[PDB]
Coordinates of C-alpha atoms in Angstrom, one line a residue:
Chain A
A1 CA -42.4 22.0 69.6
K2 CA -41.8 22.5 65.9
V3 CA -43.0 25.7 64.2
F4 CA -43.8 24.4 60.7
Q5 CA -45.4 21.4 59.3
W6 CA -42.1 20.6 57.4
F7 CA -38.5 21.7 57.9
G8 CA -35.6 19.9 56.3
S9 CA -33.0 19.7 53.6
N10 CA -32.3 18.8 50.0
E11 CA -30.2 15.6 49.6
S12 CA -28.4 16.2 46.4
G13 CA -26.2 13.9 44.4
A14 CA -28.2 11.6 42.1
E15 CA -28.6 14.5 39.6
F16 CA -24.9 15.3 39.6
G17 CA -22.8 15.0 36.4
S18 CA -25.9 15.6 34.3
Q19 CA -23.9 16.0 31.1
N20 CA -23.3 12.2 31.3
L21 CA -26.4 10.1 30.5
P22 CA -26.9 7.4 31.7
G23 CA -23.7 8.1 33.6
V24 CA -22.1 5.8 36.2
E25 CA -23.1 5.6 39.8
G26 CA -20.2 6.4 42.1
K27 CA -18.4 8.3 39.3
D28 CA -20.9 10.8 37.8
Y29 CA -23.5 10.7 40.5
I30 CA -24.2 9.3 44.0
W31 CA -27.2 8.8 46.2
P32 CA -27.6 10.3 49.7
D33 CA -26.1 8.7 52.8
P34 CA -28.8 7.3 55.0
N35 CA -26.5 7.7 58.1
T36 CA -26.1 11.5 57.6
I37 CA -29.8 11.8 57.0
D38 CA -30.3 10.1 60.3
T39 CA -28.1 12.8 61.9
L40 CA -30.3 15.6 60.4
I41 CA -33.4 13.8 61.7
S42 CA -31.9 13.7 65.2
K43 CA -31.5 17.5 64.9
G44 CA -35.3 17.8 64.2
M45 CA -35.5 17.9 60.4
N46 CA -38.5 16.0 59.1
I47 CA -38.4 16.3 55.3
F48 CA -35.7 15.5 52.7
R49 CA -36.0 16.4 49.0
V50 CA -34.2 13.9 46.7
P51 CA -33.3 15.3 43.3
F52 CA -32.8 12.7 40.4
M53 CA -32.7 12.9 36.6
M54 CA -35.8 11.8 34.6
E55 CA -33.5 10.5 31.9
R56 CA -31.7 8.2 34.4
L57 CA -34.9 6.9 36.0
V58 CA -36.9 6.4 32.7
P59 CA -34.3 6.5 29.8
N60 CA -35.0 7.6 26.2
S61 CA -38.7 8.0 26.3
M62 CA -40.5 9.2 29.4
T63 CA -43.4 6.8 28.6
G64 CA -41.1 3.8 28.8
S65 CA -40.0 1.4 31.6
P66 CA -37.8 2.6 34.5
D67 CA -34.2 1.7 34.7
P68 CA -34.2 -1.0 37.5
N69 CA -30.8 -0.1 39.0
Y70 CA -31.3 3.7 39.3
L71 CA -34.9 3.0 40.4
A72 CA -33.6 0.6 43.1
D73 CA -31.5 3.4 44.6
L74 CA -34.3 5.9 44.5
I75 CA -36.5 3.5 46.3
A76 CA -33.8 2.6 48.9
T77 CA -33.2 6.3 49.6
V78 CA -36.9 7.2 49.9
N79 CA -37.8 4.2 52.1
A80 CA -34.9 4.8 54.4
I81 CA -36.2 8.4 55.0
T82 CA -39.8 7.3 55.5
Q83 CA -38.9 4.3 57.7
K84 CA -37.5 7.0 60.1
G85 CA -40.9 8.8 60.0
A86 CA -39.7 11.7 57.8
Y87 CA -41.2 12.8 54.5
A88 CA -39.3 12.1 51.3
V89 CA -39.8 14.4 48.3
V90 CA -39.3 12.6 45.0
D91 CA -37.9 15.4 42.7
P92 CA -37.3 14.9 39.0
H93 CA -34.8 17.7 38.9
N94 CA -35.4 18.5 35.3
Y95 CA -36.3 22.2 34.7
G96 CA -39.3 21.3 32.6
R97 CA -37.0 19.6 30.1
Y98 CA -36.1 16.0 29.0
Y99 CA -32.8 15.5 27.1
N100 CA -32.6 19.3 27.3
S101 CA -35.8 19.8 25.2
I102 CA -38.9 21.4 26.7
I103 CA -41.5 18.7 27.8
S104 CA -44.2 19.7 25.3
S105 CA -46.5 16.6 25.8
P106 CA -48.7 16.7 28.9
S107 CA -49.9 13.2 28.0
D108 CA -46.4 11.8 27.9
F109 CA -45.6 13.5 31.2
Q110 CA -48.7 12.1 32.8
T111 CA -47.6 8.6 31.8
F112 CA -44.2 9.3 33.3
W113 CA -45.9 10.3 36.6
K114 CA -48.2 7.3 36.7
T115 CA -45.0 5.2 36.3
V116 CA -43.2 7.0 39.2
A117 CA -46.2 7.2 41.5
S118 CA -46.9 3.5 41.1
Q119 CA -43.6 2.8 42.8
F120 CA -44.6 4.6 45.9
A121 CA -48.4 4.5 45.9
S122 CA -49.0 3.0 49.3
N123 CA -46.4 5.1 51.2
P124 CA -48.1 8.2 52.8
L125 CA -44.7 9.9 53.7
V126 CA -43.7 10.2 50.0
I127 CA -44.3 13.6 48.5
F128 CA -44.3 14.0 44.7
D129 CA -42.7 17.1 43.2
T130 CA -43.9 17.6 39.6
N131 CA -40.6 19.0 38.3
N132 CA -37.8 21.2 39.6
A133 CA -37.8 24.9 38.4
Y134 CA -39.7 25.2 35.1
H135 CA -38.3 28.2 33.2
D136 CA -38.3 29.9 29.8
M137 CA -41.3 28.1 28.5
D138 CA -45.0 28.7 27.8
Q139 CA -47.0 29.6 31.0
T140 CA -50.1 27.5 30.0
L141 CA -47.8 24.6 29.3
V142 CA -46.4 24.9 32.8
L143 CA -49.9 24.8 34.3
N144 CA -50.8 21.8 32.0
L145 CA -47.7 19.9 33.0
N146 CA -48.4 20.3 36.7
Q147 CA -52.0 19.2 36.1
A148 CA -50.9 16.2 34.1
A149 CA -48.5 15.1 36.9
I150 CA -51.3 15.3 39.5
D151 CA -53.6 13.3 37.2
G152 CA -51.0 10.6 36.6
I153 CA -50.1 10.4 40.3
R154 CA -53.8 10.1 41.4
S155 CA -54.5 7.6 38.6
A156 CA -51.9 5.2 40.1
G157 CA -53.9 5.1 43.4
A158 CA -51.3 7.4 45.1
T159 CA -54.0 9.4 46.8
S160 CA -52.6 9.9 50.4
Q161 CA -49.5 11.9 49.3
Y162 CA -48.9 15.6 49.1
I163 CA -48.0 16.9 45.7
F164 CA -45.5 19.8 45.4
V165 CA -46.3 21.9 42.3
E166 CA -43.7 24.3 40.8
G167 CA -44.1 27.3 38.7
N168 CA -42.3 29.1 35.9
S169 CA -39.4 31.6 36.4
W170 CA -37.5 28.8 38.3
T171 CA -40.4 28.7 40.7
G172 CA -39.0 31.8 42.4
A173 CA -41.0 33.3 45.3
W174 CA -40.0 36.8 44.4
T175 CA -41.3 36.5 40.9
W176 CA -44.4 34.4 41.7
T177 CA -47.3 36.8 41.6
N178 CA -46.7 38.3 38.2
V179 CA -45.6 35.1 36.5
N180 CA -47.4 32.2 38.1
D181 CA -50.9 33.5 38.9
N182 CA -52.5 30.9 36.6
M183 CA -51.2 28.1 38.8
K184 CA -54.1 28.8 41.2
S185 CA -56.3 26.8 38.8
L186 CA -54.6 23.5 39.5
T187 CA -57.0 20.8 40.8
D188 CA -56.4 17.7 42.9
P189 CA -59.2 15.3 44.1
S190 CA -57.1 14.6 47.3
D191 CA -56.8 18.3 48.1
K192 CA -53.1 18.0 48.8
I193 CA -51.4 20.5 46.5
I194 CA -48.6 22.6 48.0
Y195 CA -47.1 25.4 46.0
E196 CA -43.3 24.9 46.1
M197 CA -41.3 28.1 45.6
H198 CA -37.5 28.6 45.8
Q199 CA -35.8 31.7 47.2
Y200 CA -32.2 32.7 47.1
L201 CA -30.7 35.8 48.7
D202 CA -27.9 36.9 46.4
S203 CA -28.3 39.9 44.0
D204 CA -29.8 38.0 41.0
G205 CA -31.5 35.3 43.1
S206 CA -29.5 32.5 41.4
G207 CA -28.1 31.2 44.7
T208 CA -24.6 31.1 43.3
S209 CA -22.9 33.6 45.6
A210 CA -22.5 33.4 49.4
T211 CA -23.2 37.1 49.7
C212 CA -26.7 38.2 50.4
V213 CA -28.2 41.6 49.3
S214 CA -29.2 42.7 52.8
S215 CA -30.2 41.5 56.2
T216 CA -33.9 41.7 55.2
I217 CA -33.9 40.4 51.6
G218 CA -35.5 37.0 52.4
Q219 CA -38.6 38.5 54.0
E220 CA -38.8 41.1 51.3
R221 CA -38.6 38.5 48.5
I222 CA -41.4 36.3 49.9
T223 CA -43.8 38.9 51.0
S224 CA -45.9 39.2 47.8
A225 CA -46.0 35.4 47.4
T226 CA -47.3 35.1 51.0
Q227 CA -50.1 37.5 50.2
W228 CA -50.9 35.6 47.0
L229 CA -51.2 32.3 48.8
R230 CA -53.5 33.8 51.4
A231 CA -55.7 35.6 48.8
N232 CA -56.1 32.4 46.9
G233 CA -56.5 30.1 49.9
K234 CA -53.4 28.0 49.0
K235 CA -50.6 26.5 51.0
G236 CA -46.9 26.9 50.1
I237 CA -43.5 25.6 50.9
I238 CA -40.0 27.0 50.3
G239 CA -38.5 24.0 48.6
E240 CA -35.0 25.5 48.2
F241 CA -33.3 28.4 50.1
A242 CA -29.8 29.1 51.2
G243 CA -27.4 31.9 52.2
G244 CA -23.7 32.0 53.0
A245 CA -22.3 31.5 56.5
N246 CA -21.9 35.2 57.2
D247 CA -23.7 37.8 59.3
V248 CA -25.9 39.5 56.7
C249 CA -27.1 36.2 55.3
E250 CA -27.7 34.7 58.7
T251 CA -29.8 37.7 59.7
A252 CA -31.7 37.5 56.4
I253 CA -32.4 33.8 56.9
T254 CA -33.6 34.4 60.5
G255 CA -35.7 37.3 59.3
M256 CA -37.2 35.3 56.5
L257 CA -38.1 32.3 58.7
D258 CA -39.4 34.5 61.5
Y259 CA -41.7 36.1 58.9
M260 CA -42.8 32.7 57.7
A261 CA -43.5 31.7 61.3
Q262 CA -46.0 34.6 61.6
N263 CA -47.7 33.3 58.4
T264 CA -48.1 29.6 59.0
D265 CA -51.7 29.8 57.7
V266 CA -50.0 29.7 54.3
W267 CA -46.4 28.5 54.9
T268 CA -46.0 24.8 55.6
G269 CA -42.2 25.2 56.0
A270 CA -38.9 25.3 54.3
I271 CA -36.1 23.0 52.8
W272 CA -32.5 24.1 52.7
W273 CA -30.3 23.7 49.6
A274 CA -28.4 21.4 50.2
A275 CA -27.0 18.4 52.0
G276 CA -25.5 15.4 50.1
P277 CA -22.2 13.5 50.1
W278 CA -20.3 15.2 47.3
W279 CA -20.4 18.9 48.3
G280 CA -17.0 19.2 50.1
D281 CA -16.4 22.9 51.0
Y282 CA -19.5 24.1 49.1
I283 CA -20.8 27.4 50.5
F284 CA -24.2 26.0 51.4
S285 CA -23.4 22.4 52.5
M286 CA -25.8 21.1 55.2
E287 CA -24.0 17.7 55.1
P288 CA -23.1 16.4 58.6
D289 CA -20.6 16.6 60.2
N290 CA -18.5 19.1 58.4
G291 CA -20.6 21.1 55.9
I292 CA -20.3 24.8 56.6
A293 CA -24.1 25.3 56.8
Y294 CA -24.4 22.2 59.0
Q295 CA -21.9 23.9 61.4
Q296 CA -22.9 27.5 61.2
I297 CA -26.4 27.7 59.8
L298 CA -28.1 24.7 61.6
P299 CA -27.8 26.6 64.9
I300 CA -30.1 29.4 63.5
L301 CA -32.5 26.8 62.2
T302 CA -32.9 24.9 65.4
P303 CA -35.3 27.5 66.9
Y304 CA -37.9 26.3 64.4
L305 CA -37.4 22.5 64.9
Chain B
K1 CA -21.6 47.0 4.3
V2 CA -23.4 43.7 4.8
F3 CA -26.2 44.8 7.3
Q4 CA -28.4 47.8 7.7
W5 CA -26.8 48.3 11.1
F6 CA -23.6 47.1 12.8
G7 CA -22.2 48.7 15.9
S8 CA -21.8 48.6 19.6
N9 CA -23.4 49.3 23.0
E10 CA -22.0 52.4 24.7
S11 CA -22.4 51.5 28.4
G12 CA -21.9 53.5 31.5
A13 CA -24.9 55.7 32.3
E14 CA -26.6 52.7 33.8
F15 CA -23.7 51.7 36.0
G16 CA -23.9 51.7 39.8
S17 CA -27.7 51.0 39.6
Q18 CA -28.0 50.5 43.4
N19 CA -27.3 54.2 43.8
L20 CA -30.3 56.3 42.8
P21 CA -30.0 59.1 41.8
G22 CA -26.3 58.3 42.1
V23 CA -23.5 60.8 41.2
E24 CA -22.2 61.4 37.7
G25 CA -18.5 60.6 37.6
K26 CA -18.7 58.4 40.7
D27 CA -21.5 55.9 40.2
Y28 CA -22.0 56.3 36.4
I29 CA -20.6 58.0 33.4
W30 CA -21.7 58.9 29.8
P31 CA -20.0 57.6 26.7
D32 CA -16.9 59.3 25.3
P33 CA -17.7 61.1 22.0
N34 CA -14.0 60.8 20.9
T35 CA -14.0 57.0 21.2
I36 CA -17.4 56.8 19.5
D37 CA -15.7 58.7 16.6
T38 CA -13.0 56.0 16.4
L39 CA -15.6 53.3 16.2
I40 CA -17.4 55.2 13.5
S41 CA -14.2 55.5 11.6
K42 CA -13.9 51.7 11.7
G43 CA -17.3 51.4 10.0
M44 CA -19.8 51.1 12.9
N45 CA -23.1 52.9 12.2
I46 CA -25.2 52.3 15.3
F47 CA -24.6 52.9 19.0
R48 CA -26.9 51.7 21.7
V49 CA -26.9 54.0 24.8
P50 CA -28.2 52.4 28.1
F51 CA -29.5 54.7 30.8
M52 CA -31.7 54.3 33.9
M53 CA -35.4 55.3 33.7
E54 CA -35.1 56.5 37.4
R55 CA -32.2 58.8 36.6
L56 CA -33.9 60.3 33.6
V57 CA -37.4 60.7 35.1
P58 CA -37.1 60.3 38.9
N59 CA -39.7 59.3 41.4
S60 CA -42.6 58.8 39.0
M61 CA -42.2 57.8 35.4
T62 CA -45.0 60.3 34.5
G63 CA -43.0 63.2 36.0
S64 CA -40.5 65.7 34.6
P65 CA -37.0 64.7 33.5
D66 CA -33.9 65.4 35.6
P67 CA -32.3 68.2 33.7
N68 CA -28.7 67.1 34.3
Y69 CA -29.1 63.5 33.3
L70 CA -31.3 64.5 30.3
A71 CA -28.7 67.1 29.2
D72 CA -26.1 64.3 29.0
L73 CA -28.3 61.9 27.2
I74 CA -29.1 64.6 24.6
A75 CA -25.3 65.4 24.3
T76 CA -24.5 61.7 23.7
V77 CA -27.3 61.2 21.2
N78 CA -26.2 64.3 19.2
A79 CA -22.6 63.2 19.3
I80 CA -23.6 60.0 17.6
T81 CA -26.2 61.3 15.2
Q82 CA -24.4 64.5 14.0
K83 CA -22.0 62.2 12.2
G84 CA -24.8 60.2 10.4
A85 CA -24.8 57.2 12.7
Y86 CA -27.9 55.9 14.6
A87 CA -28.3 56.3 18.3
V88 CA -30.5 53.8 20.2
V89 CA -32.1 55.4 23.3
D90 CA -32.3 52.4 25.7
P91 CA -34.0 52.6 29.1
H92 CA -32.0 49.8 30.4
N93 CA -34.6 48.7 33.0
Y94 CA -35.6 45.1 32.6
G95 CA -39.3 46.0 32.6
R96 CA -39.0 47.4 36.2
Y97 CA -39.0 50.9 37.7
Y98 CA -37.6 51.3 41.3
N99 CA -37.2 47.5 41.2
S100 CA -41.0 46.8 40.7
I101 CA -42.5 45.5 37.5
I102 CA -44.0 48.3 35.4
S103 CA -47.6 47.3 35.7
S104 CA -49.2 50.4 34.2
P105 CA -49.1 50.7 30.4
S106 CA -50.6 54.1 30.7
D107 CA -47.8 55.4 32.9
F108 CA -45.2 53.8 30.6
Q109 CA -46.9 55.5 27.6
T110 CA -46.5 58.9 29.3
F111 CA -42.9 58.2 30.1
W112 CA -42.4 57.4 26.4
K113 CA -44.1 60.5 25.2
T114 CA -41.8 62.5 27.5
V115 CA -38.7 60.8 26.1
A116 CA -39.7 60.8 22.4
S117 CA -40.6 64.5 22.6
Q118 CA -36.9 65.2 23.2
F119 CA -35.9 63.4 20.0
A120 CA -38.9 63.7 17.7
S121 CA -37.2 65.6 14.9
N122 CA -34.1 63.4 14.8
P123 CA -34.5 60.5 12.2
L124 CA -31.3 58.8 13.4
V125 CA -32.6 58.2 16.9
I126 CA -34.0 54.7 17.5
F127 CA -36.2 54.1 20.5
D128 CA -35.8 50.9 22.4
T129 CA -38.9 50.2 24.5
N130 CA -37.0 48.6 27.4
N131 CA -34.0 46.4 27.9
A132 CA -34.5 42.7 28.5
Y133 CA -38.0 42.2 30.0
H134 CA -37.9 39.1 32.2
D135 CA -39.8 37.1 34.8
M136 CA -43.1 39.0 34.3
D137 CA -46.5 38.5 32.6
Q138 CA -46.3 37.8 28.9
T139 CA -49.4 39.8 28.0
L140 CA -48.0 42.7 30.1
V141 CA -44.8 42.6 28.0
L142 CA -46.8 42.9 24.8
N143 CA -48.9 45.7 26.3
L144 CA -45.8 47.7 27.5
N145 CA -44.2 47.5 24.0
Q146 CA -47.5 48.7 22.5
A147 CA -47.8 51.5 25.0
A148 CA -44.3 52.6 24.2
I149 CA -45.0 52.7 20.5
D150 CA -48.2 54.7 21.0
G151 CA -46.4 57.2 23.3
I152 CA -43.5 57.6 20.8
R153 CA -45.8 58.2 17.8
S154 CA -48.1 60.4 19.8
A155 CA -45.1 62.8 20.3
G156 CA -44.7 63.2 16.6
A157 CA -41.6 61.0 16.5
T158 CA -42.8 59.2 13.4
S159 CA -39.6 58.8 11.3
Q160 CA -37.7 56.7 13.8
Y161 CA -37.4 52.9 14.1
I162 CA -38.6 51.4 17.3
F163 CA -36.8 48.4 18.8
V164 CA -39.2 46.2 20.7
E165 CA -38.0 43.6 23.2
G166 CA -39.5 40.4 24.4
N167 CA -39.6 38.3 27.6
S168 CA -36.9 35.8 28.7
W169 CA -34.4 38.7 28.7
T170 CA -35.3 39.1 25.0
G171 CA -33.1 36.1 24.2
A172 CA -33.1 34.8 20.6
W173 CA -32.7 31.2 21.7
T174 CA -35.8 31.3 23.9
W175 CA -37.9 33.6 21.6
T176 CA -40.2 31.0 20.0
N177 CA -40.8 29.3 23.4
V178 CA -42.3 32.4 25.1
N179 CA -42.7 35.5 22.8
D180 CA -45.0 34.5 20.0
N181 CA -47.7 37.0 21.2
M182 CA -45.2 39.8 20.2
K183 CA -46.2 39.3 16.6
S184 CA -49.3 41.4 17.2
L185 CA -47.6 44.7 17.8
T186 CA -48.8 47.5 15.5
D187 CA -47.1 50.8 14.5
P188 CA -48.6 53.4 12.1
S189 CA -45.1 54.1 10.8
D190 CA -44.4 50.4 10.1
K191 CA -40.9 50.7 11.7
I192 CA -40.9 48.0 14.4
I193 CA -37.7 45.9 14.7
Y194 CA -37.7 42.9 17.0
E195 CA -34.5 43.3 19.1
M196 CA -33.1 40.0 20.5
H197 CA -30.0 39.4 22.5
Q198 CA -27.7 36.3 22.2
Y199 CA -24.7 35.2 24.2
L200 CA -22.6 32.2 23.6
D201 CA -21.6 30.7 27.0
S202 CA -23.3 27.6 28.5
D203 CA -26.2 29.4 30.2
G204 CA -26.5 32.3 27.8
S205 CA -25.8 34.8 30.5
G206 CA -22.9 36.4 28.7
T207 CA -20.7 36.3 31.8
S208 CA -18.0 33.8 30.7
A209 CA -15.4 34.3 28.0
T210 CA -15.8 30.6 27.1
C211 CA -18.3 29.7 24.3
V212 CA -20.0 26.3 24.2
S213 CA -18.8 25.4 20.7
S214 CA -17.7 26.9 17.4
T215 CA -21.4 26.8 16.1
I216 CA -23.3 27.8 19.2
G217 CA -24.3 31.3 18.0
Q218 CA -25.7 30.2 14.6
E219 CA -27.5 27.4 16.4
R220 CA -29.1 29.7 19.0
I221 CA -30.6 32.1 16.4
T222 CA -32.1 29.6 13.9
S223 CA -35.6 29.3 15.3
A224 CA -35.8 33.1 15.9
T225 CA -34.9 33.6 12.2
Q226 CA -37.6 31.3 11.1
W227 CA -40.1 33.0 13.5
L228 CA -39.3 36.4 12.0
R229 CA -39.7 35.1 8.5
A230 CA -42.9 33.2 9.1
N231 CA -44.5 36.3 10.8
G232 CA -43.2 38.9 8.2
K233 CA -41.1 40.7 10.8
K234 CA -37.6 42.2 10.9
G235 CA -35.1 41.7 13.8
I236 CA -31.8 42.9 15.1
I237 CA -29.3 41.4 17.6
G238 CA -29.1 44.2 20.1
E239 CA -26.5 42.5 22.3
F240 CA -24.0 39.8 21.6
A241 CA -20.5 39.0 22.7
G242 CA -17.9 36.2 23.0
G243 CA -14.4 35.9 24.5
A244 CA -11.2 36.6 22.7
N245 CA -10.4 33.0 21.9
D246 CA -10.5 30.7 18.9
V247 CA -13.8 28.9 19.6
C248 CA -15.7 32.2 20.3
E249 CA -14.1 33.9 17.2
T250 CA -15.4 31.1 15.1
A251 CA -18.8 31.1 16.8
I252 CA -19.1 34.9 16.2
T253 CA -18.3 34.7 12.5
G254 CA -20.5 31.7 12.0
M255 CA -23.5 33.5 13.6
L256 CA -22.9 36.7 11.6
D257 CA -22.4 34.7 8.3
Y258 CA -25.7 33.0 8.9
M259 CA -27.4 36.4 9.6
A260 CA -25.8 37.7 6.4
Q261 CA -27.6 35.1 4.3
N262 CA -30.8 35.9 6.1
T263 CA -31.0 39.7 5.7
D264 CA -34.6 39.5 4.6
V265 CA -35.2 39.3 8.4
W266 CA -31.9 40.4 10.1
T267 CA -31.1 44.1 10.0
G268 CA -27.8 43.7 11.8
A269 CA -26.1 43.3 15.2
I270 CA -24.7 45.3 18.1
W271 CA -21.8 44.2 20.3
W272 CA -21.9 44.3 24.1
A273 CA -20.1 46.6 24.9
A274 CA -18.0 49.7 24.6
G275 CA -18.0 52.5 27.1
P276 CA -15.4 54.3 29.3
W277 CA -15.5 52.3 32.6
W278 CA -14.9 48.7 31.5
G279 CA -11.2 48.4 32.1
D280 CA -10.1 44.8 31.6
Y281 CA -13.6 43.6 30.9
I282 CA -13.5 40.4 28.8
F283 CA -15.9 42.0 26.1
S284 CA -14.7 45.6 26.1
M285 CA -15.0 47.2 22.6
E286 CA -13.7 50.5 24.0
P287 CA -10.8 52.0 21.9
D288 CA -7.9 51.9 22.1
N289 CA -7.2 49.1 24.6
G290 CA -10.4 47.1 25.2
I291 CA -9.8 43.4 24.8
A292 CA -12.6 43.1 22.2
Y293 CA -11.5 46.3 20.4
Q294 CA -8.0 44.7 19.9
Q295 CA -8.8 41.1 19.4
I296 CA -12.5 40.8 18.2
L297 CA -12.9 43.9 16.0
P298 CA -10.5 42.5 13.3
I299 CA -12.8 39.5 12.8
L300 CA -15.8 41.9 12.4
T301 CA -14.2 44.0 9.7
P302 CA -15.8 41.9 6.9
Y303 CA -19.2 43.1 8.1
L304 CA -18.4 46.8 8.1

């Protein structure tokens, strides 16, 4: 029935209001609604990516103890996804930075990851995502941070779970081959690395405009990444993508997903940005029942589900 | 005169970049020599002239120039330099040619020999290897800058400064995090200047008139200043801007005052931007009615 291994949505909210640390739940940030996740599951989605802030989960020093209350909501969100049989992606949505400084210690990052993985180590439907969208930082450091995360996760006995690794240049698919070639060297004793790339369809690829460049821009922008995955014997996932509810973007989205469906030897699937309870009239909202993408884009995603 | 160079970008020939070749007067336009003269009379002595590689040398960068677009580049350079000011020849290309990363240093060197040959006798031309390399291999960026230098000097253009640019959109605030390898560039004329760009809005994109704080500019160039000094190099801010408001005014003068006490490494600064097709642009330095011309230029007069 389904075309891809995974197809689903980001569930954004716990990383909102990032200028306020620790911030206040219900005021600066909010966790996803399990009831609307249930609706997306009924439509055929089977993966939900859950952004959160490292600084809220493990305050002050990333080698320290977790904050019990923010951790409790991360756990509740994750286990509600997995109790339904869907995969939950644990995403420290941190851009390679902690208190807005580049994470320069792989050893500290490895300890952070042992701490996080230890909370989920027996749940095979959890997916660990090393960090969202590394950018503007040393390329060997990005490799070493991803490897430190893998090592920390596996050291906790979390050996059944997939690990989504992310590259530099905001992990963009269109920029992957000439920036992130060194990422092919990552190692995992469980052999469960998936290369997570992001792809937006507006002029600069920022995903801040509802206008897409053209009706073929998604396919165009992931073609070289597809060939890189195949040449290197790797698997990938599109962990964020979106376009506006308009004709050109819808055609680009269909074209991109149809191209991925012809290349499932390397593409494991795709994850829309974004659902979550605090989006309102956001141009990309996948939140049931009234998000614009839930109403107008989901019908073009259903062929893959 | 506080700095070796202080002036403005003269934007327009790179407009309408989706239309190649595009049509002069419709998709793009060259700078107005009369308004350049006005900025010269205010004390500016450097004008950076963006243009598209594909419009100057179409189809293949190893090919022959387009005569019409080249003639207008030449006319613009001469309008600037005949007065005694410096003209920066800026292939405003982001490390890319027909939207693909420039992966051949040899082809890029040939492009640069072609361009430098047109200006080799003019000591007031400055060659800028490429605008704002980004999202590409760090060793390639080094190699492209070196290939440009080699091409320029091979043409006999030996008197001119060469502005080199780094990765991360050549940002000053990101320089030490990504561009350390750029220290190894060599030039037989010993006239390399490291050109960095710095904007003052939250994400550094230079698209908002709001600045983060009254100190954001000086903050964002401190580690780059230290890198230049530690490595025995000289730099220039080749693009900067802020909105016509109190916070940005203060951020601009605080950044320039810091550069002024660090002229062992900083050669000066170049505003973004003047040019004839900006209209009501938040940063327009175009005389007589650009917002920055009216409201920012008065705060820059102490540096002219």
